[PDB]
Amino acid sequence: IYDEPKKGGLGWDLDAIIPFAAIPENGNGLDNIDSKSEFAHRIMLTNLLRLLGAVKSKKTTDTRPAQCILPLSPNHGTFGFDGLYSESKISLETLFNR
Amino acid sequence: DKTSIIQPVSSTIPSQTIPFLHIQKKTKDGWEYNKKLSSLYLDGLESAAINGLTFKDKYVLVTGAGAGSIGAEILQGLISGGAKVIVTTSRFSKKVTEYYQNMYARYGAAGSTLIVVPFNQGSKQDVDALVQYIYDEPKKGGLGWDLDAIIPFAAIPENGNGLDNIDSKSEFAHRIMLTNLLRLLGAVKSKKTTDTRPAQCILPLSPNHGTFGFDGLYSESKISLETLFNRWYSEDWGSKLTVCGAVIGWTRGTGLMSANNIIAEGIEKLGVRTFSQKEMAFNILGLLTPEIVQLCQEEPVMADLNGGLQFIDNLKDFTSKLRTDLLETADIRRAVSIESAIEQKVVNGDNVDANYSKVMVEPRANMKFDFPTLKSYDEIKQIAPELEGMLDLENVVVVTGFAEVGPWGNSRTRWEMEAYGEFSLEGAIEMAWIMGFIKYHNGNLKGKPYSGWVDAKTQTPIDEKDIKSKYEEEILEHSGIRLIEPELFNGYDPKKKQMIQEVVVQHDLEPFECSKETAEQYKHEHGEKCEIFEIEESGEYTVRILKGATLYVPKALRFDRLVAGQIPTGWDARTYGIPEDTISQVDPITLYVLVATVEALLSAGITDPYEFYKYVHVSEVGNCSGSGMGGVSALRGMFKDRYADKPVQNDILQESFINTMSAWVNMLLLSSSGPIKTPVGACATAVESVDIGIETILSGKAKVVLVGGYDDFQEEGSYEFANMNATSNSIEEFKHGRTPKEMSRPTTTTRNGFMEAQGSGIQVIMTADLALKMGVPIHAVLAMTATATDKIGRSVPAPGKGILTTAREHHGNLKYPSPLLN
Amino acid sequence: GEKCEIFEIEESGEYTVRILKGATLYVPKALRFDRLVAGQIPTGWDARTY
Amino acid sequence: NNPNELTIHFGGAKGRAIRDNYIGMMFETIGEDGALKSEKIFKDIDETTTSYTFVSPTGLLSATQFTQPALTLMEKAAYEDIKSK
Amino acid sequence: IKEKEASAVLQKELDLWEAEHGEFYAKGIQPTFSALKSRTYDSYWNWARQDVLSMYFDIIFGKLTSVDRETINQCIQIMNRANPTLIKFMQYHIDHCPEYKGETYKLAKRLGQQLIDNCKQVLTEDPVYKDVSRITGPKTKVSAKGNIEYEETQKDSVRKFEQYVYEMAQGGAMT
Amino acid sequence: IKEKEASAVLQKELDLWEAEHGEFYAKGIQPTFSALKSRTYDSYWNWAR
Amino acid sequence: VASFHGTSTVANDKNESATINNMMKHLGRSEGNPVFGVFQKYLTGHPKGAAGAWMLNGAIQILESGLVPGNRNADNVDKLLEQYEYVLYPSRSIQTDGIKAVSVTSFGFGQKGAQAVVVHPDYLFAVLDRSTYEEYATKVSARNKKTY
Numbered sequence A: 001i002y003d004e005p006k007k008g009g010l011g012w013d014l015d016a017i018i019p020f021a022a023i024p025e026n027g028n029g030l031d032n033i034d035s036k037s038e039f040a041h042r043i044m045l046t047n048l049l050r051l052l053g054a055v056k057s058k059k060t061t062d063t064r065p066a067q068c069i070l071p072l073s074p075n076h077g078t079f080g081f082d083g084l085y086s087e088s089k090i091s092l093e094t095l096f097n098r
Numbered sequence B: 001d002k003t004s005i006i007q008p009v010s011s012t013i014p015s016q017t018i019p020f021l022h023i024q025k026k027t028k029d030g031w032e033y034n035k036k037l038s039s040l041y042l043d044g045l046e047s048a049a050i051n052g053l054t055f056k057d058k059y060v061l062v063t064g065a066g067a068g069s070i071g072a073e074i075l076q077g078l079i080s081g082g083a084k085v086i087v088t089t090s091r092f093s094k095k096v097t098e099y100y101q102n103m104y105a106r107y108g109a110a111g112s113t114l115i116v117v118p119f120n121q122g123s124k125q126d127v128d129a130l131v132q133y134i135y136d137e138p139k140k141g142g143l144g145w146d147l148d149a150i151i152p153f154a155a156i157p158e159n160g161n162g163l164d165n166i167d168s169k170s171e172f173a174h175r176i177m178l179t180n181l182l183r184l185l186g187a188v189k190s191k192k193t194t195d196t197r198p199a200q201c202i203l204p205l206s207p208n209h210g211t212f213g214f215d216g217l218y219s220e221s222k223i224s225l226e227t228l229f230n231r232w233y234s235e236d237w238g239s240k241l242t243v244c245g246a247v248i249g250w251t252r253g254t255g256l257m258s259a260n261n262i263i264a265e266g267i268e269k270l271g272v273r274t275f276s277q278k279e280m281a282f283n284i285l286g287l288l289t290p291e292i293v294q295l296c297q298e299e300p301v302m303a304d305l306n307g308g309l310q311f312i313d314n315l316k317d318f319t320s321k322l323r324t325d326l327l328e329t330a331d332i333r334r335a336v337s338i339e340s341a342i343e344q345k346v347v348n349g350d351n352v353d354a355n356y357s358k359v360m361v362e363p364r365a366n367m368k369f370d371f372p373t374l375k376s377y378d379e380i381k382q383i384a385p386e387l388e389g390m391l392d393l394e395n396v397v398v399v400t401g402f403a404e405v406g407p408w409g410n411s412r413t414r415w416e417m418e419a420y421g422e423f424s425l426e427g428a429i430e431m432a433w434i435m436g437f438i439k440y441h442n443g444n445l446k447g448k449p450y451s452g453w454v455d456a457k458t459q460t461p462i463d464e465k466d467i468k469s470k471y472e473e474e475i476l477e478h479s480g481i482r483l484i485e486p487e488l489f490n491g492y493d494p495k496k497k498q499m500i501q502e503v504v505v506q507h508d509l510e511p512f513e514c515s516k517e518t519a520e521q522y523k524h525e526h527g528e529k530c531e532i533f534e535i536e537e538s539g540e541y542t543v544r545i546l547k548g549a550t551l552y553v554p555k556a557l558r559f560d561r562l563v564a565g566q567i568p569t570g571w572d573a574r575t576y577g578i579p580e581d582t583i584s585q586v587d588p589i590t591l592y593v594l595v596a597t598v599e600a601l602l603s604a605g606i607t608d609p610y611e612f613y614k615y616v617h618v619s620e621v622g623n624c625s626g627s628g629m630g631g632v633s634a635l636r637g638m639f640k641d642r643y644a645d646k647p648v649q650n651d652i653l654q655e656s657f658i659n660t661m662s663a664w665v666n667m668l669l670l671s672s673s674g675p676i677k678t679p680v681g682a683c684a685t686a687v688e689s690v691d692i693g694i695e696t697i698l699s700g701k702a703k704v705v706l707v708g709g710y711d712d713f714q715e716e717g718s719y720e721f722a723n724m725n726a727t728s729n730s731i732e733e734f735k736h737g738r739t740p741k742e743m744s745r746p747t748t749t750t751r752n753g754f755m756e757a758q759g760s761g762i763q764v765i766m767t768a769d770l771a772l773k774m775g776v777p778i779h780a781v782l783a784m785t786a787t788a789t790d791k792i793g794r795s796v797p798a799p800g801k802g803i804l805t806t807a808r809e810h811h812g813n814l815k816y817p818s819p820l821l822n
Numbered sequence C: 001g002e003k004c005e006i007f008e009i010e011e012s013g014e015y016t017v018r019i020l021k022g023a024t025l026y027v028p029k030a031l032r033f034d035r036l037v038a039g040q041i042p043t044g045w046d047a048r049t050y
Numbered sequence D: 001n002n003p004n005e006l007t008i009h010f011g012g013a014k015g016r017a018i019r020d021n022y023i024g025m026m027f028e029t030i031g032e033d034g035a036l037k038s039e040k041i042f043k044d045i046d047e048t049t050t051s052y053t054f055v056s057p058t059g060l061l062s063a064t065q066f067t068q069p070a071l072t073l074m075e076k077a078a079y080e081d082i083k084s085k
Numbered sequence E: 001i002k003e004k005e006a007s008a009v010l011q012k013e014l015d016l017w018e019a020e021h022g023e024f025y026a027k028g029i030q031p032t033f034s035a036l037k038s039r040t041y042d043s044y045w046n047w048a049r050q051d052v053l054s055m056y057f058d059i060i061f062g063k064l065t066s067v068d069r070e071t072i073n074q075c076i077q078i079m080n081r082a083n084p085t086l087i088k089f090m091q092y093h094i095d096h097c098p099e100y101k102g103e104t105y106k107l108a109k110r111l112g113q114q115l116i117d118n119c120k121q122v123l124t125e126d127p128v129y130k131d132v133s134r135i136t137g138p139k140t141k142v143s144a145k146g147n148i149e150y151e152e153t154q155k156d157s158v159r160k161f162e163q164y165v166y167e168m169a170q171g172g173a174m175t
Numbered sequence F: 001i002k003e004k005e006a007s008a009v010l011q012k013e014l015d016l017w018e019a020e021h022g023e024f025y026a027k028g029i030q031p032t033f034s035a036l037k038s039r040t041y042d043s044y045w046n047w048a049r
Numbered sequence G: 001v002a003s004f005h006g007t008s009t010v011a012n013d014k015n016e017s018a019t020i021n022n023m024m025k026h027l028g029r030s031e032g033n034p035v036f037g038v039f040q041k042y043l044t045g046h047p048k049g050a051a052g053a054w055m056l057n058g059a060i061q062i063l064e065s066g067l068v069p070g071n072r073n074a075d076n077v078d079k080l081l082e083q084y085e086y087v088l089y090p091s092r093s094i095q096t097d098g099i100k101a102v103s104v105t106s107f108g109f110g111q112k113g114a115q116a117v118v119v120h121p122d123y124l125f126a127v128l129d130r131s132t133y134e135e136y137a138t139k140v141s142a143r144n145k146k147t148y
């Protein structure tokens, strides 16, 4: 995205990011956090933050900030068996302080 | 001990004031300070303060309790109360487990049990196996435990990994702290079966969710831990687990993030409070009072131990400017000092400023010999009342000297490494001297005259202090029980113990040339199964082995016992002065016995052996010492070496003996004619020699007698001790993670056999009055000595209680006590 | 060391081994010794008799 | 799996909802006073005891309070299976 | 050639893991737990007699005066392990503690008598955790030369946890 | 024999990853992005008509 | 003290304690006056022949200084040994105020065990009058400098 067309990039400069991708994981209660759950946590948090930590690095000018949009949720473990969906979506709030 | 508090602290809470340690309660709006719960919590804490807690029959798992960490401080709390704790170390070494052992010996309340286990929280497979090892039965190797409380604190110091530099260390830390911590609970739940014993989790929450700077995924890890509260309702394990979240505040502790101990004094000036590690331990142990316990068993409990720091806006900026001003005073007070120092050094000149620096004193070593300190006579009449004129001096044996050569050097450098675990300065240059690290060079050294200690490898002068700081690592690395170093044993490599295999040839070999009589012997010892043919141009024969002959192929096999208490690597007799001839001739163990005997006599204040003959006749200086199986190096030579026809000393058999050592002693030092005897009690042989010494002296047969033992470790002896299953297997000690220096474990619940070593030991015992007539140091008084044969059996290795008979007596009726004791 | 080779017999699981040039072997031999006399215990002595 | 000891646990709600049953067991042994002393069986169980343990060196299946329920169950089981036929 | 390329296959498999996860993660997930390495620590019944003794001489050698807090800490630690044999072990020692040899012996005999009487009560009573160590707070000063030293000195107003809790009661909402 | 055991070494290496992470995770982390597969959609001027 | 043979084996470590306990029982040790166990084999190993000599030097050095070494590998004392009341198993060096006498028991193959007892040198010096002690002290001093 940030590389030049002469190198195959796009010359773009992201004004807004909408990282919504997520996995349907279900029935994985607290005791059955399985590989699908760790993969989902990776997709939703520990790789989502890496995407932003990359886009920041690719930026050089401080006049064009990239407004992130973060698909938060009001249900932090208030529902039943969804695996690591909670401590994924809730860890996204730390950015505000960060 | 059980006072009684009437005025609960709950009444001391100032009106509408939030305490420093308050419980929070959830409402539809969220969490907020509840006065009732927090008042209760504080009351339990005060009771714990003046009376204390009890965790009898509390089964706890504690994780991430490294030394100098919070988790280590609640261990002292759990054990002191009577817990049943599982511990875990991300890394397991000797210093770790011994630290835990010191803790358990200093706070191991009766009933309490500790368990140290290696466990990495980063592995799905470590967590799978750990709870199994906890919840499985002893008959399957488990523990039969059932965790009442979990304290999963383990975490990684990750720092400087900002948002853009979330690296592999960050993902690993997130795994340790959240996505593997939850798996631990999801496992413990599965292992549970009864809903009457819920496991109170303790969750090290934090009040700073990304409010600090660059810590990587620390935030969205610790903050994802709060979802459990809602999940305790949403999911099904409400009764298996009860969550009890703690929000640990500013801990002025080590590791973790202690990176800030310097600004604690600063921020405490806002009326906010930090905590020491013991204080934070207390604050959390309060979460185990039997009433908080119940409270958790129906409600997830948020506990805010953050000491009010949450009332500081932009605490990040506050701490940053505090540390900034601290550094800005530090550096300017440093630089202005430097400037005014150099300004003076210019004005006053650099010729007097060196005179302001005081001429400090370098320390040397002061190796004395220091005979045991004599108390004054009248003083000794107080230790002992009227024992005077009672004993016949001529019939009291007294050890006047002693010495050793053991894996810790002489008797001094062993006693020090024993009673002190660390070498003093003198006891360090000595171990250097006998290990061949330093050599007292004298004369001119690179032009300059020199009389002092010098390195042995590069031969450069070294002060007496750099001895320790420079060699202490190596000395402790190459001395005492360690893995066997082959260069001390002629290439005996336990990993490649050599053996020969009886093998029958199937195809005649290629004819090779050999000598005349060798060919003749080959023919005579192989029969027609070989051929010999002379080379008329050489006279020496060719020989071809034919099909059907028996060959002996070499082979090796990985052996187990890779540890033995070698003599300090680098020990050499030349350092003592044994002539190179004798060195080249006799068995190594004789060297040990001689170097022991000389300094034993020295320890007796004897410079030259002949001094005895000034007060005693030549036929009254005996040597009742002897080995257990001494000479193994020569027994090997005469049995397994000659069979190979390796070039072997001709008269080896004169050293293979056991009296041949005392022979060399008399031949080289005493030249006496006293009673030579020689016991063999292989294990208990140096004590029976003392009994012989006494029955000798009291008989008047001799007035001085060397008495001691000695033996040498070698291959064939070790292998056969192994096949008897006597020495502890080294491989099985390393599967058990026992480091070499600690698998010699007397009286230990998990002992597994002994660890053999080499060396010698000598004592110059002597009649009493002759001792105090020569004026020698009476080091001791051998009162009693005996030996015994145990009982009829069919197994030599099994001991028995025969030695008990030294104390048997008669107890029929004591109305008339024996007047002879008065 | 490399001075020999080992190879499994898949039909047996037990290996073949070939020694290579340069290895050290141990050939048996005998030599006529001198001391042919010693005061043996009476030939035929046996403890079972006791 | 007849063990040698059994530890009852009064855990959360239903854990307390059991130890109260044990507490409620009040038997009578007419002493020298003769008074109908509604006295407690388990003086070791109270509002504080979190968990109680039984011990039988031979095996719990030999303790009278556990063996005779096992016997009456096995006997009634056999009888009912027979009556089913 | 066959294993040489199949090995390349599993290599092009394995390098994917490290490329996606990075080194430190791969080095850290190395499972290390082995039930054989456990270390159970039980024999309190012996450490109790060890510690009684170690105190008995530390007292007479003046390395622990009665006013200290650590002596009381470990006396609590002692009575947290009292056994009917511990009482006898201490009792004999106190009986034969020779007073005429000096003054510290009197201190030792008397403190021992006190501890004996106490363990005779707390005997059969449940072990208790009662920390007595002195409360300490931070105190970071910079040297007059300019060196930053961090000292965790004792509080003067807050010395027992009995006082620490009252201090925690006064809180920071009204600071 | 040499590659047959070194392959066993890297196998005892690789199986650790899957044992600690499990299958689905290993199957899901298979990187799939390739700049060559982009599809730019521009020609609005034609879709309009 | 009782300088134990203590060869970290299964049978030895229990048999030795059994004998010490029983013999201190038969002689009527004052109850609650156990003897300490020092186990040099933890540190030096087991010098299959000369074990007694190392143990005896240990005993004499103890008699001199008054210190008592400890098994610094005393991980966890075996449960069975709690029944032997008349013994103690230190794991930490404890400098005492003085030791009267030390036992040294050592066990061998084929049931040749043995036991030595080393009483403090001081109790010897008290059998003899003043003049002899003082005169001996002078010669000792001289020998000490010469040996130094």
Ligand SMILES: NC(=O)c1ccc[n+]([C@@H]2O[C@H](COP(=O)([O-])OP(=O)(O)OC[C@H]3O[C@@H](n4cnc5c(N)ncnc54)[C@H](OP(=O)(O)O)[C@@H]3O)[C@@H](O)[C@H]2O)c1
Binding pocket: B063, B064, B065, B066, B067, B068, B069, B070, B071, B088, B089, B090, B091, B119, B120, B121, B122, B152, B153, B154, B155, B156, B157, B176, B204, B205, B206, B248, B249, B250, B251, B252, B253, B254, B255, B256, B257, B258
């Ligand atoms: N102290 C504070 O101010 C503070 C503030 C907020 C939260 N907390 C929480 O309280 C806990 C205490 O931490 P701390 O900062 O006081 O000390 P720390 O330096 O965080 O302690 C780390 C401990 O965790 C263990 N550990 C490290 N890596 C591990 C791994 N990969 N697997 C298993 N165990 C591992 C170590 O034990 P071994 O050395 O035995 O391996 C070590 O002793 C933390 O877990 C943290 O979440 C503390």
